[model samples]
Target chain A: PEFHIFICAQNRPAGHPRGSCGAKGAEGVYNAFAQVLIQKNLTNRIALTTTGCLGPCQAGANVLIYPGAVMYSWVEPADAAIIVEQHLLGGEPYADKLTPAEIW
Target chain B: PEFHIFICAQNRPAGHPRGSCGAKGAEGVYNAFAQVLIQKNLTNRIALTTTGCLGPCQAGANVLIYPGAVMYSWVEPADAAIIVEQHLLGGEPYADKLTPAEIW
Candidate 1:
């Protein structure tokens, strides 16, 4: 089964509080991830999806990986390379970005 | 010395996808933190504020510590007590809850 990557593209309509994640830079992160997947030619093995909100709005631009259910918070476009290489391909997590696991 | 604690209550207003963090139990997290502070009688030593968003919406209920500028993602109401006692009152950073330092 291919790994699933979910990114939240902001949670509101627009002009809200701090603004949506897309406004904050989630779009860039998404583009970066897409570019990396294509560069690595791993599109066939990976599936990327944009979600509404994973429940942590304050931490916009969050990324979550399935199977392992690992969540990463405050991801920037610059970090996409590390995520793709270390987590997607290398099968290791980026320790610095790992979110606290939701045990319950 | 007093410490500042900021909670992202969702960048957007209401509705939209995934709803706001306050809608996703962040209000409860706030209440819990408030209760703990009152119980500890540290209200005067701590200041709690709510902001729009910090750029990672997927990780709702995110908390950021000012002065220290430490960010904690995907925080739940259940974790409030520990945060208050360990981080706020104890004058020590919560090792497990510390987010990656955002240094420009």
Candidate 2:
């Protein structure tokens, strides 16, 4: 794959001791990305995969991009388009959605 | 947390198609880090947590460090001590154990 996107979909039961991306809205984010990729016909060049967890669940939903390892945190479903257009298509990361530099 | 560490510990059953850190020896790696941290008496300064997955399962036993988001791949149990002593205490990333720059 030319580009790989790993989105965290780790889900824990309600009221569980641990936090998770699923609880933080990972599924919607994942679906949003998937829909955009297919709609834009970028599927052949891109690979989107769901992951169990990507750490820092408190700051999730997390998305990890490979070949750059650029991580995005606290992503909303609506943020997928710019991420796909600017980052995936335009070859630049969406600065606003990137995980905080304090963590990087 | 001062310095946080997230290690992938995803476990899949035998014969499963998907690869995971647990299959590649993350438990031992986690234990090694735990032992080193305990021996060095750095528990209060550092926080270690187990995670489900961290995107690249092919690169098993992945560790993500916070305040840097420095990810280490294919980590061996023996590398824990140096990681603890050098990176955790020395205020710099352990270059030897860092994930490839091509990914970051």
Candidate 3:
């Protein structure tokens, strides 16, 4: 695959102090990625996987894009296309959504 | 939880150029963490989760530690106790195992 994308889909029980990616709507983000990849005919080049918890539960939903190894935190469904177009296809990292330097 | 650990367990089919964490011995790493945390009696304060691929396939057995959001690449089972002692307990990032500056 040209790029491998891993998005968190981990779920935790309700009322847990540490939240989860699934509870924060990671599935929507995954769907958005799938839709955009299909629309742009780039599905063949990209591989998508719905993963479990990515450690920073509070900062999720998280997406990790490989080859460059860029991690995007607090991702939303709306940010998917821009990520796919700007970073995945254009060979640029999405500056705004990237995991903060202090954290990474 | 005082700290959270995410260890990748993603497995790809054999013979893929881009490798995986599971095939590279992530289970051992996870077990090592489990054993150390238990031995140290820090299980209550810390949380552990087995996650999927964390984007850096070339660097197998990736471990992500939070709330500091530190990522360690090419982790081995032997490194688990040191990570738990120095970083998890001593409150410092494991410099040796850290994901390179360029990748984050």
For each candidate, report its DockQ versus the true two-chain complex: 0.02, 0.08, 0.19
Query: Against the hidden true structure, what lDDT does model 2 obtain?
Result: 0.80
Please estimate how well model 1 matches the true structure, expressed as its whole-model Cα lDDT: 0.69
Question: Alpha-carbon error at A24 in model 3, in Å?
Answer: 13
What is the Cα-based TM-score of model 1? 0.46
| Residue A76 error, candidate 3, Å | 12
lDDT of 1 by residue, A1-104 (tens): 25657676754767777556666677888888889888888776775656555556666678867545577887888778898899878899998778755520
Ranking by lDDT: 3, 2, 1
- Worst window of 10 by summed lDDT in candidate 1 chain B: B95-104
- The digit string of per-residue lDDT tens for model 3 on A1-104 reads 67767788988997789988898889899999999989989876787767776567888899877655578998999899999988888888888889886655
Model 3: per-residue lDDT, tens digit, B42-62? 887887777777678788789
Reference-based lDDT, residue A75, model 1: 87
lDDT of 2 by residue, A16-38 (tens): 76688889988899899989999
lDDT of 1 by residue, B1-104 (tens): 25656676654557767556666666787788888888888776775655555555666667766445566766888678888887776778776656545410
Error of 1 at A3 (Å): 0.6
Interface RMSD of each: 13.2, 6.6, 7.4
TM-score of chain B of each: 0.79, 0.90, 0.95
RMSD of each: 12.8, 6.1, 8.1
lDDT of 2 at A61: 92
Give each model a TM-score.
0.46, 0.53, 0.57
